[PDB]
Amino acid sequence: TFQASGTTGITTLTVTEECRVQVGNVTATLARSKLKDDTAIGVIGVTALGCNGLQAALQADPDNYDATNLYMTSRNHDKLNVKLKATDGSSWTYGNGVFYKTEGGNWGGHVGISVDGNQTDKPTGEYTLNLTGGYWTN
Amino acid sequence: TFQASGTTGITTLTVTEECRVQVGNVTATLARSKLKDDTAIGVIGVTALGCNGLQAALQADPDNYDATNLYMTSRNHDKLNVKLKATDGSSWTYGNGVFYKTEGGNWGGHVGISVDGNQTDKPTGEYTLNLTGGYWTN
Amino acid sequence: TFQASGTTGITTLTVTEECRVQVGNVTATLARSKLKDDTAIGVIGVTALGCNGLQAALQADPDNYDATNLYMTSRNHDKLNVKLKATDGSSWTYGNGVFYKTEGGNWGGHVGISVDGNQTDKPTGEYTLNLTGGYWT
């Protein structure tokens, strides 16, 4: 079970055509044709404190998952299925919107987000994923 | 014709009285009496990539233009008419909410936003302008 | 009387359990047990210009004060009482949502936000305080 305790981090990806124009703050873009399985999207920093004896976890917003997939979502509820992996090779489990660390205790590092399955038929626009910090108990 | 492809950048101006207090992050402010033709408001970064053969463009939100003017808007739909100019002297055309580059191809730089006509009669408040990246076809 | 003129600064504090996980952009967290009187929460920059003859001022959102207290507020309407103090020792007055400088004129500095009274029973979540610039007549 996830218990919320911590802050929420936003990850944004804008799906574009091959010609694209970035305006203002620099944020990630990928052309439709580049939405292939395992394509890197972004990284999010994660730091777990005061967690001796407990397993660090992230929870996706309910706008970002269903029973089978984690996904970034557009303003029109278009969905880009994605997957999470810690960059340090540490062991985590994903299911039902929760990404939780196998070994307990403090940890700091980064979680990579990548495309989960070929999705070149998805539309252009801004997609967002919110992940909230907390811990997992059994 | 504007084809959406790219990200959106927001530009903000707070119109104030002569005595004004900036709280938090530093942002652009102008007293009502300083809303004179050609007064600089801000600049926004713009980068066109993958655009061989195509003209870079920006599109304003529908509640940032009308048939004659581009404008920043307050929460009460007050309109501060503004104009756009690439800071490197490159040639662009403005019409009907679209700012599009004359020469096709990749380009990066900045677009300056300035007051378009003396407007010292406009009220205090926060005014915003959103510009979305894409390209122009004929 | 407060007259609005200037910008708004948001200050956020996330109240956590003892084990907590910070994700993405760094913002302030404190565990419930750390909500002790005088605990530092944050600082906010404040710059007054064009204010010859007028006193610089901040106004809290209506959701952020009552006759007795200034407070950060959660989306569940929980209240964390806080207090303001300029970091340079300058003299300001707080009352009924307005923090205004005793000496008129231009000034640039920072205002510290701290916990006002022991409040270790407050619930977890994101608490916000919005302060808007202006001047006092």
From Swiss-Prot, chain C:
Cellular compartments annotated: Fimbrium
Keywords associated with the record: Fimbrium, Signal
Pfam families named in the record: Adhesin_Dr (PF04619), Dr_adhesin (PF12393)
The UniProt record lists the keyword Transcription: no
Entry keyword Signal: yes
InterPro entries: Adhesin_Dr, Adhesin_Dr_signal_peptide, Adhesion_dom_sf, Dr_adhesin_sf
Any one GO cellular component localisation term in the record: pilus
Primary localization: other
Recorded family membership: Belongs to the Dr-adhesin family.
Known role: Hemagglutinins of uropathogenic E.coli mediate adherence to the upper urinary tract. These adhesins bind to the Dr blood group antigen and also agglutinate human erythrocytes in the presence of D-mannose (mannose-resistant hemagglutination (MRHA)). C1845 is a strain responsible for diarrheal disease.
Name of the protein this chain belongs to: F1845 fimbrial protein
Gene: daaE
